[PDB]
Amino acid sequence: EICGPGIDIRNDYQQLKRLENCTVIEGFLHILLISKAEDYRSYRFPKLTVITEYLLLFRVAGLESLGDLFPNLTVIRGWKLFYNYALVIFEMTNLKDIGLYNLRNITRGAIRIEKNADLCYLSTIDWSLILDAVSNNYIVGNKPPKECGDLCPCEKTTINNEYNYRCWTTNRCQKMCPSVCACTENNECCHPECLGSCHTPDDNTTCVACRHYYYKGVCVPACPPGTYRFEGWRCVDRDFCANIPNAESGFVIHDDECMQECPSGFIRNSTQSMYCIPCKVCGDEEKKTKTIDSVTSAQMLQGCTILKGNLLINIRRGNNIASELENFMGLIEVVTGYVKIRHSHALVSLSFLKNLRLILGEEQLEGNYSFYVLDNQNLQQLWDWNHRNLTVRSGKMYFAFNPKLCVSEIYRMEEVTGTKGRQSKGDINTRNNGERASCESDVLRFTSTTTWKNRIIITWHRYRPPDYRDLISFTVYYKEAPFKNVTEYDCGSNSWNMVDVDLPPNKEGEPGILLHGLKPWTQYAVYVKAVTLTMVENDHIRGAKSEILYIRTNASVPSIPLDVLSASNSSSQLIVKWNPPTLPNGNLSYYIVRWQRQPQDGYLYRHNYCSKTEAEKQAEKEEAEYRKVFENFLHNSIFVPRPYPFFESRVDNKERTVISNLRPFTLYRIDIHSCNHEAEKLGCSASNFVFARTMPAEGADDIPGPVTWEPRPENSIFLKWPEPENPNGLILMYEIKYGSQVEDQRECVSRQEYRKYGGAKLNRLNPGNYTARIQATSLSGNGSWTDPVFFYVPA
Amino acid sequence: EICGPGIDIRNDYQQLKRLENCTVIEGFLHILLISKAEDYRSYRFPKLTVITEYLLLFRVAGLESLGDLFPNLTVIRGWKLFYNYALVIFEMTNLKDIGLYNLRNITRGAIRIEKNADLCYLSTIDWSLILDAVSNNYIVGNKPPKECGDLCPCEKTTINNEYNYRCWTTNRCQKMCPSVCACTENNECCHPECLGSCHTPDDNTTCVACRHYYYKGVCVPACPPGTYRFEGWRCVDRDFCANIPNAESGFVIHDDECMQECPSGFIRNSTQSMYCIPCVCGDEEKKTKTIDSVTSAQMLQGCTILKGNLLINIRRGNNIASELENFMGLIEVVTGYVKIRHSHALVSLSFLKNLRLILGEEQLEGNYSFYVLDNQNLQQLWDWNHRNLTVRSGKMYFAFNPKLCVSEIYRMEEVTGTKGRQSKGDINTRNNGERASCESDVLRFTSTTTWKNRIIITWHRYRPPDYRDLISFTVYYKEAPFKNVTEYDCGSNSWNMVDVDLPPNKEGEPGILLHGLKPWTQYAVYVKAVTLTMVENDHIRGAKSEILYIRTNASVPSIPLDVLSASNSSSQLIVKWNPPTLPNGNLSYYIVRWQRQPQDGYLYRHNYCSKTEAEKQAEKEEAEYRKVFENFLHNSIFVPRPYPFFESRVDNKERTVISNLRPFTLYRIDIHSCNHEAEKLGCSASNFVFARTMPAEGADDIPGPVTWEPRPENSIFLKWPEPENPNGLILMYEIKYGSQVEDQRECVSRQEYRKYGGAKLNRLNPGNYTARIQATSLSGNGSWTDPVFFYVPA
Amino acid sequence: TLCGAELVDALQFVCGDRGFYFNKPTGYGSSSRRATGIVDECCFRSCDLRRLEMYCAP
Amino acid sequence: TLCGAELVDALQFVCGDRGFYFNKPTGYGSSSRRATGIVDECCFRSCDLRRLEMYCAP
């Protein structure tokens, strides 16, 4: 059953009984100001599932949530909005959470929940899945999220910052559909004509409430000719919307749809008043003014041709609602009164009033004003183009505070509409009308430019206004923009970089500019603005701007590489890695990585150890004006009418490279150098030498020959042997022994006495047999214990 | 000789001959546009010495200086100014230097030289002594001082930044007078009635050109009744300014002074037209008299009723409102509008104290009989209770005046009787006085509490007529150690915006917390209540709080700097400190403590003797949107019915004495800096420093006989006591030993002393031992004692 | 003067159990009246009890 | 249009040795005329040589 034309609940919870016996409420549904004295009885209303127009909740006392009373509400059509809002919940008390789990879609409006100190479970639930224009939402003044700390027992999707569970309440998450494709109860897509939930898929008569139309329990994108549209939701027969208790204070059919009225020129047919014949004009004669704030106040004006009143537009916020606006107001052609526009920050351009052609202005504002704007923070472009005509019969015209509307635009519109003699600088100024944005200005051509690694010189053609005496001061702005999307409005937070350059003195060439301390090899965006004064207002004077110029500075030497590490993997295989420098200073081309074998330590060799702020800008402008006026007075007054070598390599592809000649324990000089593409002229980077000592190695670290001995006068042990050429760096303490029958007491045969003679000497030693336990030790410590060597003094 | 009535030189150098035969000239002196082709003959004019009004130099070609033509010019009176300027030098070429050395004093005007690429010698010469109002000068666009680099062959005095010489040119410096007191040629005073230079001092008839008047070669502050003033400089009889070739296109005597014309009511007497009898200006053609400077203001002097328009553009100047009220505060009614544009030199329009009625017979566009614009300093109109003013007809406008408070314009609007003729389109409030607010709603501070670094401030709940107007509170705080504070917005020690939220639905007292605050400081803090004005609906003056000076609680000071130690004498260790960097409270006293420290364990146990605008506007729009939505909601819903530690207390001076000084001792000293709130806070932190005293042992010898003991086959044993006060500690006791004289060094260690007394060297060569003993400590070799006769038997 | 939260808080304080009157017509479409009425009557001029309580259901 | 220094320069270029005319009256006081005259005639509208050379002494 369908309830119409709209239900209001006020001051009685028991009045909910009026919603017992209907499943659809065509119209608006108010529940406002219900006393909490009546007990909450879990008034389940599963019959209600869809409502054509908005749903308003206002200070329901004692209500805990919404699932208890509205379990099956699945889509709100929002045909007739409520101040840009299709479902509004205001000043909630006792309402901890919202239980509208069955809700799936809302066509027109945007949500608005505000000033509810007990309610939460909002940041959990994502709205883009239900409503189509998220940016028009308004959720402020509820329980702060920190003080709420919600939890949920239903996926996790990044809502513009990060993913999280989407949970209606503590009991149940919201429901989505699989990405394969309407949606049934269990993860399956239904008939296309369905909307929200369905009983069985691919059916035209089992939809709970189907989109784009409804009729006789079935659904169709365009209902049959025997039926006519009803609030964009139903199709009814001839009889329904003919004998309907209209009480306009019946319906007429245009284009096989029946609505309340007919457009101008179309009138109820004679003897066929439910039909139309060719042959609006709305506007109340009493109020004479129709404040416009949102589509609720604009839709009432739809289907109007002539407005006998005052248009006063102020739509303070919204998404691209101009699309909606042109549908309800793109049909008026003449307004008898004025057209004021205040605070309408949501109008980037007023083109939606295309069909407006004449403003009668029969009765004006104060001071005979038939047009008026104010504080419109974004009216960036009026609609007065060559494609459209517009006439003001009488009255002045005003402009103020529009920070984007350019002065050229308003001058064009004033000359098109025919009010040139009726204006003044007092009305339509230029100090605050679009000072934040301008479109057209005088062209400044860059005469020439030269560049350096950190220096730039720019010259532009001399700009002479009609009065060259004007302060033609030049302000150059430069930004490090590695892209092309650059905004040309004022510095500070990396937006731009103001620099002022003096006027061209009486040396009348090209006024140049120098920039220094610049980062090499960067796409600077540089452009100059010609700030000038105007003396008397006299309007116009569009300044002079230059094309935003991209300049790539000359490059310099790159810095040192990063991750400078060297490691050993094999003999003649040393791995060394690097990294592109922090400031490459130009496109890299290749690397010149060179290593030098280094001589060993000298002390081990010589000593072998084997044993403008606004105020001053205004002051400058005033000073320039003073100079100009003084010398103008002077000219006026005086005259009077008559009656170990180094090895290079070129490797740049990868970071780590292999070096050969890895002599054990040898420090090297692997110098990395990142050459840019201009290496032939620029060169490589800074030095990146690394001293890389290679792996240990002993091999045949023992004596490269027989360990021979030599007797002497009263027993002394002399030795003779060669010296190994590849020790573990260098021999340190050669571990041999000596003893009576077995070599037990250590005999430190140093390489010093070996180099001098060949071995040691211990005169008058006890004779006996010797079994040599020899260890080839190097500076790394004790080396390899060789097998018992049988060189011996005679026993 | 006096030349009249004013001399102009143009296009002919020979025209200078017109200045040959008069010592003074009354009238303007123009020298403009002289071609250099004429042979510059150095036309000296010592006769001309004073000019009654301005001197104008404009584009003289081939002129090198000013001494060559005006050597004796001493004072310019500037009775009839030239656009705020009494001597103007414009577009000079070939004029490298100015040679007006004789010039001494300019009465009225201010100097102006500019746009001269070849002229210099300006920053050298100071004007304040010569010109009575230096602040109105204008000298720019000339040779830059760096590119000039002048020099002088005149003492050094400070021109607002530093002492320097004053030098007219490379040849001559200026002349001044000693601090004794006019001035003669040689550093001596003159007659009081004299001006500038003198022939002989203290005479009335020898002044070169005397101040305050002149007559028949003599001077007097008030010339006799038989004489009358002339351009404020001369006095003449009736026979002079009666037959004078006036050609006003004669003169009349009012108040024993003869001028051109009489005020309204006074007319030339019948048959006595040179006299006035009791019984008005304004051009009827131009009908508008732009007022740029005191020239255009002076031409209106003595005007009663103005039949035209007033257009005041006073771009700059010093306190010239005095002159403006002198020669313009006599008009009573203007037939037309009174526009005021760019007049930045009018801190108040009060100089028109005699204006009462503005007829406004013909108005501006749209019937405007009053108009202001861009006046950067019109801080206060003159519409006070003492003044009455009436506008017969026409609207009234205001715009861009950043100091003119809105209350002032509303008061003037209601006083003048144009209340029904105004609209918010004309007299706005977004720019009018946006930089200066006179009064507002009183914001009373309910309570305040303070910490060392924390402050909490509570104020009474402000409530505008519509409570939903966001009463957004912005607190500003400045580290102001004084009382002179300017209450305009920040950053560098001006103020600091901190926004505090509206009082939530917990309607008590809104409060604000400040933290990270430097202790013991006089913060100047106050809160402004920013609120949206909704639709224009005029008024709404906001809410301002009294600027509150609050001193934060004290805290511990930092450790003292300049903390050092030194020694001068025994029982006297000096230690010095300095006031801390961050006292956090007035210092009261210092507790300074020193500790005698124990010796080294290793050196003793081991013996060794051997709101950006965009978001603010967004917030305002948000607050307006909330209100509009709620109002729509209420309208739509409801419907009508049908080794101890020693302390001391010294604070007077930094260097403090410390007792118990033994030479070469290591002491640690701790310093605390207690503020004048030490009763509860306590004191500062601990500033500790270690220091070693002076080395001194003197004769730290053995306190007794150095006895020698024998043994089995000869050995040298010793016994002795130990010196109690060495230079720190005994290190290497330089005893000796030898066959006949003790010559080979011996270290009879204190190890064996503490063990037995002395060393032992068994089987030593016998002989006599004359002991060379040196008392040594850890500092090294000490006192070489005399040969000690403790000998082994020979 | 009072606007907004006070209004309802005043309005409730005036009616309580009486309830707020509504001219509930059936009608159809936007022709039935329209969407100043209160804030003009209360927010821009002080409204006394005699002028305000009239919004109460009998 | 021409304004400022150009003026006198252009003026010089049109006069040279001819010189600049001045209506030198003797008179006395400020009654004789006053201190638009040129910048109206040249700065706010382009002045031709016919309109400009007239300022030259014969």
Residue numbers in the entry:
A (entry chain A): 1 to 153, 162 to 189, 193 to 260, 265 to 294, 300 to 510, 515 to 635, 679 to 710, 750 to 901
B (entry chain B): 1 to 153, 162 to 189, 193 to 260, 265 to 294, 301 to 510, 515 to 635, 679 to 710, 750 to 901
C (entry chain D), D (entry chain C): 4 to 38, 41 to 63
Sentences from the paper on this structure:
The insulin receptor (IR) and insulin-like growth factor 1 receptor (IGF1R) are a subfamily of receptor tyrosine kinases (RTKs) and have pivotal roles in physiology. Unlike most of other RTKs that are monomeric in the unliganded state, the IR family receptors form a stable dimer by inter-protomer interactions and disulfide bonds, independent of ligand binding. Insulin or IGF1 binding induces a large structural change and stabilizes the active conformations of IR and IGF1R, which activate signaling cascades. Moreover, cysteine triplet (human IR, Cys682/Cys683/Cys685; human IGF1R, Cys669/Cys670/Cys672) which lies in the N-terminal region of the αCT helix forms disulfide bonds that covalently link two protomers.
Notably, such conformation does not exist in the dataset of IGF1R-WT/IGF1 complex. In this T-shaped IGF1R-P673G4/IGF1 complex, two IGF1s are bound in the top part of the ‘T’, in a similar fashion as the binding of single IGF1 to IGF1R-WT. In the small population of particles, however, the L1 domain together with bound IGF1 moves to the top part of the receptor dimer, leading to a stable T-shaped symmetric conformation of the IGF1R with two IGF1s bound. Notably, the distance between the two membrane-proximal domains of IGF1R-WT/IGF1 that is mediated by the unliganded L1 domain is considerably shorter than that of IGF1R-P673G4/IGF1, which may favor efficient autophosphorylation of the intracellular kinase domains.
